[PDB]
Ligand binder design. Structure first.
Ligand SMILES: [Zn+2]
Ligand SMILES: [Zn+2]
Lengths: 550, 170, 126, 340
């Protein structure tokens, strides 16, 4: 109710004298500029169409003056018509313009001019004449063969490019890289049109022997868009080579993953596994270099937010998908794991790989015992010929969920003299760069808290205040999520749950943290086939109600 | 007239074959491993990497940009992109069994120091390899990623309540 | 060197699993003080073939291009006419090899060109 | 069953007269009527158009009507071609009336209103008018874009997609006449030949012969027409390249023996001059020495079954003209020496 023309009326002249730039784009540079400026102009058209549809035509003159020239430019510009709904919005626009009963002959002229451009778009051979007259004589219409026609056109070229790829230093026709670059710009406007997929596949695969790129990355990223938006449905080898030759696509897609775990679907891990397996990210990650990239990205993410739980959850989902994609399709000659994990020794990794589901529930204690032993041998006796230091082995340890989370729940099950192994381990988890002075401090802290909570579980379902009393920091999140483990695990819970929860419910940040923790633990149980349905339904109801509070 | 030989066409058979293997798409990576398996099996177990690196580094001319401008390139950049990347990936893994002297100059190339329109991949890869050598921290903003990437990463790392984990030791 | 290595197996799925779980369960029993064999025999809970057939270990039947068996159902049937190579190869892999090779020449349907491994005349009939 | 017949014939009447520029009487009622008829008919296309006696009966009505009107005289109307053409029946007429400028005021406005009320009815299960037409113009622009911005004219014409497209159009167009047996395919081929550009026609047929079948009876009917018709064969062998005709012949050995005589006629009606070491044409439009040499060199580069036809047709044509062994005397020896 404020501007009513000007945010639109300025961009009117902008796009207007930009059509004068492009004008059917029979060049390279008109084409390139048009390609980047298409969709913005499309939204401009949406606003314009709204502004027209709401009102009548043939009475107002707001920007009606140059409109015919504007639309004629757009129409004769075919890349306009190649983008998704641009054409259709042009239709609706022109429909807004028509007059039922032209009264002054200018209205009739307008309408006839409209019909003319319409037929120009719809019933016009913009094409060879021989094949036109051939079918005219055969008694056909454009329609009834344009699809298969198009298809044949595509297929010829698709084969051709395979030939060119196979010709790895032959004497034969080295196909024009100019035509290739022409196609690179021709595909993208109509990338969504279904008859094109094999061409694009072939463009991305038939790499050839240039030392320098010959496609424009506008194409690479306009492709990346429709991949990650799932409008294209390509094979896997195509998108891997795309990721593997154009880096900003990879970067921008890994970003698009974070967009979900932060923006929309905080702590619904099944959406996250769904997204990972929807894309071929673990499959692509089977390739080493891509794995190292995404590792570096998550490492930066991890050192900005010093221990973001949602991010760590995402890591472990991705690691699982990657491990299975690796075990699937790498029978002969798979990469030695210190490829993907060089800084660490391989021995520790070799242990970490083992699934919990392989082993009975009892020996997981012994597993974690040897693990924490080895982490101590690593980081405490931090000698050269190993990891650089603590952070690196800690980051290694992140990726293997279950082996990370089982310490608390096992320690709840082994508070009968909880062994120093698990204490040091979880201390190392919740704290890197601590020093043994800090680790021994937190050790006895949590062990005294265990002396409390053991007897507290042996007692009846006591209050939430005997719990909040032992709270009063360097050990707040540790002790917090430890208590959360204790709650569901101990059957004394399920009564004082909301009490403890509303007590610790200071903020929404801690709320989201714990929500992620809970979705994590439920996800873990369902995957492991390890459940107490009490705690399942309990945590379910709680997480559900807290998804209303946020 | 509009034909060229292979730029590798003049070389030791094993290594030339290896290049012709790495040429072959993504999978060429693992084919690299298969080659070395086959050759440690074959009568010539000693594969002189030292020999190979020299030929990678060695310069030769090209006439690119306009029609009227010479420049030099080593083998390593004139050969096709996919072989470069596959090769780099293999090198990461065989890094134990390589000589530093040649590796370093290779990495000086890998930097593509003052290469307008550079190879982002190769740059990141050289960075990472130098890091794996324990010498590529560089005391720089030594991110294989772009500062663009790190920027829009921090832009959303801001939108999460950090943990109290002491990761930096300020 | 006495440490645990990075290790795994190749072969048949059903034979693979049980030893996998033996390892999964005896891994904490690693002792980098005796022989690694001493560690292995009692972690995987087995004794091993000391050259069960020293002669016919594996005359490998992989592609040699893609190092694979069963390429779209195809066997690497195409071989070298050479005593020193004898290497099997896949039809399509060896095709796309010798096609890109500059030295190759096409007949009506049959093509000739150098064996990848030994560089001797090899013939492929589609 | 018969309800479909009177539904269809009235529809096709209305279809053909859509384009006709008598349009003054029309109103949106007629518009809606035609449109809902077309909607019912594409509904029928969906419903039980698939394999059945009704499918075949309606296809018989189609070809019956199309050979009744002929495609000549009173109208060479394209019309809805067949079963699959029915699938977009409304669309074709919508296109007809746009170009029919007898299209008036009110029915036109109501028409465009029907077509494009906006995305106000964006939620619909059937891929409707707007979606279809959008994809249409999408594909059309795509077609021209490729034609001008990456398309190349293949030297191997059979490989070329346009000729390949037209080839399968025509094979579609003749399998139907072979199934129908209303008139012979020869009556159709003749009328075609005369009416349309014969230069393009020959090339189209050249590519047509070589498409592997899909259901090769059309390939047979062609050679049965064309070994009968030589005046086409005269310009045929004249207009085309060498290897095209070579592989055509290896495909249809019936064309081998005739084709040797074609050249052999041209081969004998030339004269050496010792001003210039060449045979040369008496007439302007006679095949040059090298013009023919190319063809025979292609035939040398042919399969062995077709190789020895010409190889001995040459020796026989030589010896009957005197079995000389030196230039200036025998065109055929000039050849046979040039071929080595
Ligand atoms: Zn193979
Ligand atoms: Zn060999």
């Amino acid at each position: 109710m404020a501007q009513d023309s000007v945010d639109l009326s300025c961009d009117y002249q902008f796009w207007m004298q930009k059509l004068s730039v492009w004008d059917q784009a029979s060049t390279l540079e008109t084409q390139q500029d048009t390609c980047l400026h298409v969709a913005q102009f499309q939204e401009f058209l949406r606003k314009m169409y709204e502004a027209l549809k709401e009102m009548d035509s043939n009475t107002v003159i707001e920007r009606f003056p140059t409109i015919g020239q504007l639309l004629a430019k757009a129409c004769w510009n075919p890349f306009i018509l190649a983008y998704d709904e641009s054409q259709k919005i042009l239709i609706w626009c022109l429909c807004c313009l028509i007059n039922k009963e032209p009264q002054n002959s200018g209205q009739s002229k307008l309408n006839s001019w409209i019909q003319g451009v319409l037929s120009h778009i719809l019933s016009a051979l913009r094409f060879d004449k021989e094949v036109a007259l051939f079918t005219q004589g055969l008694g056909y219409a454009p329609i009834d063969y344009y699809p298969g026609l198009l298809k044949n056109m595509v297929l010829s070229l698709a084969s051709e490019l395979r030939e060119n790829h196979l010709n790895g230093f032959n004497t034969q026709r080295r196909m024009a890289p100019e035509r290739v670059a022409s196609l690179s710009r021709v595909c993208v406007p109509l990338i969504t049109l279904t008859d094109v997929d094999p061409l694009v596949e072939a463009l991305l695969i038939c790499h050839g022997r240039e030392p320098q790129e010959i496609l424009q990355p506008e194409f690479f990223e306009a492709v990346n868009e429709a991949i990650l938006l799932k409008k294209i449905s390509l094979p896997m080898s195509a998108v891997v080579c795309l990721w593997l030759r154009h880096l900003p696509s990879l970067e921008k897609a890994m970003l698009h993953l974070f967009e979900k775990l932060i923006s929309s679907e905080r702590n619904c891990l099944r959406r996250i596994e769904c997204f990972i397996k929807d894309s071929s990210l673990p499959q692509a990650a089977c390739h080493p270099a891509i794995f190292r990239v995404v590792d570096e990205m998550f490492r930066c993410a991890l050192l900005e937010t010093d221990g973001a739980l949602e991010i760590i959850a995402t890591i472990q989902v991705f690691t699982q998908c990657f491990v299975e994609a690796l075990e699937k399709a790498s029978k002969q000659l798979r990469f030695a794991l210190k490829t993907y994990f060089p800084y660490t020794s391989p021995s520790l990794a070799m242990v970490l790989l083992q699934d919990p589901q392989d082993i009975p529930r009892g020996h997981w204690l012994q597993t974690l015992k040897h693990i924490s032993e080895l982490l101590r041998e690593a980081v405490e006796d931090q000698t050269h010929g190993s990891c650089g230091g603590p952070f690196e082995s800690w980051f290694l340890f992140i990726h293997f969920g279950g082996w990370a989370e089982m310490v608390a729940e096992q320690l709840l099950m082994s508070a009968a003299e909880p062994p120093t192994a698990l204490l040091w381990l979880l201390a190392f988890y919740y704290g890197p760069r601590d020093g043994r002075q800090q680790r021994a401090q937190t050790m006895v802290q949590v062990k005294a808290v265990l002396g409390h909570l053991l007897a507290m579980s042996r007692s009846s379902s006591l209050s939430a205040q005997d719990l909040q009393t032992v709270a009063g920091a360097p050990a707040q999140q540790l002790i917090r999520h430890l208590l959360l483990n204790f709650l569901l695990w101990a059957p004394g819970g399920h009564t004082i749950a909301w009490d403890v929860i509303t007590l610790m419910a200071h903020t929404a940040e801690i709320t989201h943290e714990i929500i992620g923790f809970l979705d994590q633990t439920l996800y873990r149980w369902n995957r492991l086939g390890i459940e107490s349905p009490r705690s399942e339904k309990l945590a379910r109801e709680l997480l559900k109600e807290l998804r209303t509070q946020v | 007239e509009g034909v060229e030989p292979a730029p590798w066409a003049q070389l030791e058979a094993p290594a030339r074959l290896l290049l012709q293997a790495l040429q072959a798409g993504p999978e060429g990576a693992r084919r690299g491993l298969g080659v070395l398996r086959a050759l440690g099996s074959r009568g010539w177990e000693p594969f002189d990497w030292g020999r190979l690196l020299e030929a990678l580094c060695r310069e030769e001319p090209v006439v690119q940009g306009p029609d009227g401008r010479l420049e030099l390139k080593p083998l390593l950049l004139r050969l096709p992109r996919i072989c470069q990347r596959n090769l780099m990936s293999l090198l990461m893994a065989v890094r134990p069994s390589l000589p530093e002297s040649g590796l370093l100059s290779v990495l000086q190339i890998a930097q593509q120091d003052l290469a307008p329109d550079p190879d982002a991949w190769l740059r990141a890869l050289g960075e990472l390899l130098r890091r794996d050598l324990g010498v590529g921290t560089s005391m720089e903003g030594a991110s294989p990623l772009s500062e663009r990437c790190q920027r829009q990463l921090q832009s959303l790392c801001r939108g999460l309540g950090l943990g109290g984990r002491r990761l930096k030791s300020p | 060197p006495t440490m645990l290595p990075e290790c795994f197996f190749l072969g048949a799925d059903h034979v693979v699993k049980p030893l996998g779980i033996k390892l999964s369960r005896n891994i904490h029993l690693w002792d980098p003080e005796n022989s690694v064999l001493q560690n292995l025999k009692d972690v995987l809970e087995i004794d091993f073939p000391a050259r069960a057939i020293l002669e016919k270990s594996d005359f490998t039947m992989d592609c040699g291009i893609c190092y694979a068996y069963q390429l779209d159902g195809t066997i690497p049937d195409q071989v070298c006419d050479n005593s020193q190579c004898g290497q099997p190869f896949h039809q399509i892999c060896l095709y796309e090899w010798l096609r890109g090779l500059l030295t190759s020449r096409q007949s009506f349907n049959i093509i000739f060109g150098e064996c990848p491994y030994c560089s001797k005349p090899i013939t492929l009939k589609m | 069953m018969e309800s479909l017949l009177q539904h269809l014939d009235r529809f096709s009447e209305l279809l053909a007269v859509s384009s006709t520029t008598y349009v003054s009487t029309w109103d949106p009622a007629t518009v809606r009527r035609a449109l809902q008829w077309a909607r019912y008919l594409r509904h029928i296309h969906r419903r039980f158009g698939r394999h059945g006696p009704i499918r075949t009966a309606l296809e018989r009505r189609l070809h019956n009507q199309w050979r009744q009107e002929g495609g000549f005289g009173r109208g060479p109307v394209p019309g809805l071609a067949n079963f699959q053409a029915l699938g977009h029946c409304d669309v074709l007429l919508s296109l007809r009336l746009l170009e029919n400028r007898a299209l008036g005021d009110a029915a036109r406005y109501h028409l465009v209103q029907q077509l494009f009320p906006g995305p106000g009815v964006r939620d619909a299960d059937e891929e409707t008018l707007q979606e279809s037409l959008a994809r249409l113009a999408r594909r059309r622009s795509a077609v021209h874009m490729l034609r001008f911005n990456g398309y190349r004219e293949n030297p191997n014409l059979q490989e070329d997609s346009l000729m390949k497209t037209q080839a399968e159009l025509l094979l579609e167009r003749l399998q139907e006449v072979g199934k129908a047996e209303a008139e012979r395919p020869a009556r159709f081929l003749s009328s075609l030949w005369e009416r349309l550009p014969q230069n393009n026609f020959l090339k189209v047929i050249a590519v047509a012969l070589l498409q592997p079948p899909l259901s090769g009876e059309g390939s047979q009917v062609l050679v049965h027409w064309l070994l009968g018709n030589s005046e086409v064969f005269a310009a045929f062998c004249r207009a085309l390249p060498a290897g095209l005709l070579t592989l055509v012949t290896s495909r249809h050995p019936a064309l081998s023996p005739v084709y040797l005589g074609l050249l052999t006629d041209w081969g004998q009606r030339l004269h050496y001059d010792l001003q210039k070491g060449i045979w040369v044409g008496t007439e302007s439009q006679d095949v040059p020495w090298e013009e023919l040499h190319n063809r025979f060199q292609s035939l040398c580069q042919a399969p062995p079954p077709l190789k020895d036809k010409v190889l001995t047709a040459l020796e026989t044509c030589k010896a009957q003209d005197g079995d000389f062994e030196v230039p200036g005397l025998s065109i055929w020896t000039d050849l046979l020496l040039a071929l080595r």
